[PDB]
Write a protein that binds this ligand. Structure first.
Ligand code: COA
Ligand code: NAD
Ligand code: MEV
Ligand code: MEV
Lengths: 378, 421
């Protein structure tokens, strides 16, 4: 029943904003006081989180309004230093509301862990010997996380890739494919990969080197859609139809020119990374998966798509890797990460991922709209 | 001058760490007070930085030790949530010190402003019309920012690219090449792009669309070098020669497989982004420039290089775009961004950019050395043992006792903190 529209929110005091947020969600007094006074992350907690700590560092904590995800209103916390991001997110979310809001979907929460093996005289043969015994390897990985498996996750499969031409000789690389449920999953699959490497070595006869997740998490994709009508985009100087054509022009620019794509995709992360930070997740992992995926073709291109549908409406998509957690890393440890998660209402990590790509799509739309409607000076 | 070794820093309390830092830099009591107390970012400043603000959000603020840049010791502040990063960077700086530390340099701080032109049937011809009048275009860009020119910057050149066959028809893109001095550059070059847009329209007869910086800042490069000897890399299990070979195996793996390079480059930005955050700079811009640069060849690869020199020593490089500012929005506004700059001692944006690539190179070395020896999990999971305790159902204050036990048994897993609980 949540209403995320938040009229005049942009003009209230932070206290009145905090007040209003707590009314809508039924936030407890303990929850509200986490943001009412500075220092919600005690030094006892901060000193255990990273090394050589001498203090804490604040960034603003904001809430984007209007977002609606498969028909459900959602409030979006965001932590960033740069102006205009929150406004643009909120305004595009407001336009998206009229045409159904954002529509999202996602894959299962699957992470790859790589096991690199050098020194094999017959790596292509060894690959088949490895695959043939994958159940044994899968069983071995799952012994190290009885908890994960009890919750419906765990190692599901193995794939093997080979690299014949390398300055350091031929390389075999096994991928454990692991359902990590509500975790982002890095430590989980790293333990699994370290655990299975000796059996793998025994089968293939090489020497194991790296045992490590891949951040190109292309089995953990999240998807968002948005639709905008010409009427919604009409400005003083341009018809709504001309604005749509200009947005498509800017999109094709990003699609052919990496100099533009880098900036175009930067605007997307302007919307995603602040949500990642606000929920205590690793934003370097999200950035690396985002940009590596944008050039999987060998050409660094745009993560979003923008089209005109058969009705003349502007339709955008965002599909990308989105590894995030509700548990693990620092997401349980930072009190405000827990509060961010309560504000969002998410019950699985994949639901958080779908919100992330919705916000990234909205940020890109706001960026391109502003750039396309800016008249030429004279 | 300054000594960045910080003996026993890892085991001092945050307050005693801060006192030692204060002593070393001659910080004032007011300066030290900004980290000895919560809320250095006042709400009225936070509320004016971004929209819909309802509070602030803290991340830990740390200092990495041992770093040395071109013979000078430097203290490096870092803001991040993930354990092991700061320790690995300090460790690798420690090793680098024995062989001269990090050697760095950087190019002039040049950014591209893009001006996209559509609506012409002759973009190839129009490109030559622009190049013919480039001095008139550069001169008009430079009256728009006369202060910047007195500071030693400004528009130096233009280049012009064509994409004559795109789905939306032909398309011409002019790049202004702008020296932005000590700014990241976005607003400087964006203004200049707007200024030249009607003149380019008149020259080409097309319609200008986007006027915007590029974050693929490949004319704003920073460079770091490091050297490590085999004796420094020996462990009880492994010869230092074997570790160096294992590191080269790891590097060749990143060079051929994008599934590996993504993670490899991620480990570099574990080092760089927290320094960007600590100085109030835009970390999305640095990430976009970094990863897009890693694919410029048409294959997504490693930002660092690792080799064995003729003495058998491990030598590493990092050259990448590094657009950062000492001025510009959050950097002057956030009191702790100003303190970070004071701790760093940097006098130009390029000095800061060179520290960033030194840290990123050190970070990448730290991950690879762990990966090529005992595995990432041993040292990292030990420092992660409190989060594993909290996750497995501790929190409260039994966090210290089960995290202690997890580290004694060298088995930091949720399964183990559960059964210990
Ligand atoms: C984490 C790691 C530093 C543990 O150190 P170790 O192997 O047990 O070695 P040592 O205890 O001898 O420490 C050597 C140096 O590392 C640094 N260091 C190690 N642990 C540290 C800690 N808790 N805090 C601060 N600095 C630390 C120090 O500079 C130390 O020097 P010192 O002898 O003056 O104290 C090491 O395993 C590593 O570098 N792992 C890679 C971690 C990584 O890459 N993380 C990215 C995120 S996974
Ligand atoms: N290159 C990288 O991205 C990289 C590499 C190494 C480490 N890391 C770090 O790893 C950390 C995240 O690792 P993680 O996600 O495995 O967290 P974690 O290791 O802290 O916790 C994962 C464990 O939580 C348990 N768990 C409890 N409830 C669960 C639930 N509902 N769903 C799934 N698991 C549950 C599981 O037993 C799991 O093994 C981040 O701090 C990240 O920065 C990242
Ligand atoms: C405006 C933009 O550069 C974000 C600025 O931080 C994104 C874009 O150009 O698409
Ligand atoms: C350890 C690493 O994954 C960073 C962890 O955040 C980097 C790497 O694999 O090189």
């Amino acid at each position: 029943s949540l209403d995320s529209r938040l009229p005049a929110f942009r003009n209230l005091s932070p206290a009145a904003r905090l007040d209003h947020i707590g009314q809508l969600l039924g936030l407890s007094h303990d929850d509200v006081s986490l943001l009412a006074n500075a220092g919600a992350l005690p030094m006892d907690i901060a000193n255990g989180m990273i090394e050589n700590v001498i203090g804490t560092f604040e960034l603003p904590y904001a809430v984007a309004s209007n977002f609606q995800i498969n028909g459900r209103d959602v409030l979006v916390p965001l932590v960033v230093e740069e102006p205009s991001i929150v406004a643009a997110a909120s305004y595009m979310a407001k336009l998206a509301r009229a045409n159904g809001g954002f529509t999202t979907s996602s894959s299962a929460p699957l992470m790859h862990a790589q096991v690199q093996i050098v020194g094999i005289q017959d790596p292509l043969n060894a690959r088949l010997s490895l695959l043939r015994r994958k159940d044994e390897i899968i069983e071995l990985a799952n012994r190290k996380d009885q908890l994960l498996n009890s919750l419906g996750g765990g190692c599901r499969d193995i794939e093997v890739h080979t690299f014949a031409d390398t300055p350091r000789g031929p390389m075999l690389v096994a991928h454990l494919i692991v359902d990590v449920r509500d975790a982002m999953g890095a430590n989980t699959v790293n333990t699994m990969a370290e655990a299975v490497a000796p059996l793998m070595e025994a089968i293939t006869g090489g020497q194991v080197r790296l045992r490590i997740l891949s951040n190109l998490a292309d089995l953990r994709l999240a998807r968002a859609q948005v639709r905008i009508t010409p009427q919604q985009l009409e400005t003083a100087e341009f018809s709504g139809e001309a604005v749509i054509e200009g947005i498509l022009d800017a999109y094709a620019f990003a699609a052919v020119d990496p100099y533009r794509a880098a900036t175009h995709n930067k605007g997307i992360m302007n919307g995603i990374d602040p949500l990642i930070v606000a929920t205590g997740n690793d934003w370097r992992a999200v950035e690396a998966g985002a940009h590596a995926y944008a050039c999987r073709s060998g050409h660094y291109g745009s993560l979003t798509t923008w089209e005109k549908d058969n009705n003349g409406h502007l339709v955008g998509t965002l599909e990308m890797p989105m590894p995030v957690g509700l548990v693990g890393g620092a997401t349980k440890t930072h009190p405000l990460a827990q509060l961010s998660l309560r504000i969002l209402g998410v019950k699985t990590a994949q639901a958080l991922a779908e919100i992330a790509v919705a916000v990234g799509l909205a940020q890109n739309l706001g960026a391109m709209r502003a750039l396309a409607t800016e008249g030429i000076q004279r």
